[PDB]
């Protein structure tokens with residue numbers, strides 16, 4: 331199932347400790363104050379704690395990552411309400427940031443195998459092109475039906491607009507004053 | 521070799537398998553050898569090959585081998601080159617009710633048993649939807665008792681799904697479709713086997729109901745909660761500081 | 763005087779007591795009184811047991827003086 335995995339992952343958040351001190355718990359608590367909506371993670375810390383996520387995240391990273399995103403959102407909601415009760419509406423998904431030092435693999439030794447898996451490597455940087463934007467949450471109205479709807483995109487910054495809500499094909503206009511977007515850039519390496 | 525076996529062992533969905541794979545391999549070889557059999561999308565080039573492979577070796581079974589326009593064309597070309605209850609007196613087939621039972625993902629033995637029940641007792645009918653619906657609902661309640669017990673939400677969801685699949689807004693008729701079939705199917709040995717297998721016995725265990733009905737007070741009515749429940753619940757407030 | 767630990771364990775599993783605990787959890791972000799009273803120190807638990815045992819169950823008395 332997926333919920334067994336999501337629980338085995340959420341336990342890693344608050345029930346993990348080293349050097350007799352919480353790390354990710356208070357890291358999240360500080361991050362929410364910073365208004366960061368992100369974190370940092372070390373995948374070496376996850377091998378010893380639990381092996382039910384490593385061997386399956388290795389081969390199905392795209393399948394497993396959004397679950398971790400939603401779990402982080404849940405933890406954030408709980409801690410947000412509890413902190414509001416402690417002292418002193420819109421909480422989007424939190425980006426997951428991780429690193430590693432297991433190994434490095436050069437571009438020369440790549441092949442057409444282990445495609446869609448996770449890999450490590452080194453290189454040098456060249457390009458800083460442009461802040462090209464993508465959409466995350468944008469609203470829609472039908473031009474004839476005046477029928478409002480909504481759409482949200484998650485990770486691929488798969489599906490297109492609806493082909494039919496007579497109005498005919500292409501019945502939707504795209505709003506901007508009530509939409510949401512993020513940034514990305516096309517980076518090179520050699 | 522992978523796709524060939526994928527399609528060949530798709531027939532279920534001793535010598536049969538081996539001879540069929542050999543026949544498919546050599547038949548595809550013959551069809552692709554000459555320049556006479558072209559414009560043939562591999563998308564579907566392992567279906568009537570399998571049909572004629574079944575035809576060849578020893579025995580052939582018409583049903584569920586062709587299971588369309590170009591199917592006959594390729595056959596000839598190769599063989600030359602070589603609400604729902606008000607409706608009255610409805611009709612049904614094997615696969616229609618197999619589909620209706622398979623929308624739940626229930627096993628095949630239960631579906632076959634329902635089909636046998638239908639083909640044995642479908643002569644004096646008024647509406648087969650009622651009997652089949654009751655049968656599948658009382659199969660779901662008997663097999664899914666564990667998850668229903670651990671989540672009393674299922675009851676409403678399942679009933680809504682089987683009320684929307686038959687296109688009705690009233691549900692007391694569905695309740696009748698359940699209780700009447702329970703009355704009718706109450707005394708058959710295969711039903712007995714299913715009962716002993718999935719241990720519903722009206723949704724409660726045998727070893728508890730005997731003492732519940734015998735006239736004792738040691739009967740375990742679980743208003744209290746199990747120790748493991750408390751043990752696993754403690755963790756929720758263990759981390760209450762956050 | 764014979765309020766035993768096993769009795770404490772089994773009475774802790776009371777669902778209305780669970781409702782009380784969770785209501786207080788939501789009412790107060792700090793969690794000092796719950797750790798003061800809960801099973802983690804059974805003295806407070808038994809003190810609470812006696813405190814809410816001496817109550818009158820006012821429904822019965824209400825019925826009585828309603829008849830009156």
Ligand SMILES: [Zn+2]
Pocket residue numbers: 472473474475476477495497501
């Ligand atoms: Zn429209």
